[PDB]
Amino acid sequence: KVFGRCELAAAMKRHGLDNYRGYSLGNWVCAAKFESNFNTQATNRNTDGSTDYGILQINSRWWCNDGRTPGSRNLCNIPCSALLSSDITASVNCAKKIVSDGNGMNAWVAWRNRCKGTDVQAWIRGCRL
């Protein structure tokens, strides 16, 4: 599923991301835009052999199992394929785990380079919810 901007903002609000660890909704919508272009099916291989999965491009080195990332962990206890569904629950729940670890939203290089220190609230303006 390729989400619309306001559709994703509403779904992210529904599933608990607004103000999660002090990150207002716009942060999450902005990150998703530059990570996946709002595409739940997005995958991208990295030079280290891991892959990033889904609308928030969650990485197999630590967070999910894809059966091909040597020496990796599965801290969200999910197959990485679960992160590709139209239902964003697994991606949201796993992202909550990731952002609780120290660096906050800086784990998304896309967030640091494209969203941080910008008008992130702009990504949710004009939306119903």
Contacting positions for Ru ion (CB under 5 A):
59, 107
Please tell me whether 48 is known to bind a ligand.
no
Catalytic, 7? Answer no
Catalytic residue among 52, 66, 87, 119: 52
Gap between the Cα atoms of 129 and 117, Å rounded: 23
Amino acid at residue number 112:
R
Least distance to Cl ion from the beta carbon of 128, Å? 30
- Does 115 participate in binding Cl ion (rule CB under 5 A)? no
* 12 Cβ contact list (under 8 Å, min separation 6): 18, 25, 28, 29, 32, 88, 92
- Spatial strand order in the sheet of 58-59: 43-45, 51-53, 58-59
- Does 58 participate in binding Cl ion (rule CB under 5 A)? yes
Stretch that binds Cl ion, among 11-19, 34-42, 52-60, 88-96 (CB under 5 A): 52-60
- The site for Na ion (CB under 5 A) is made up of 60, 65, 69, 72, 74
User: Known catalytic residues?
Assistant: 35, 52
Residues of the binding site for substrate: 101
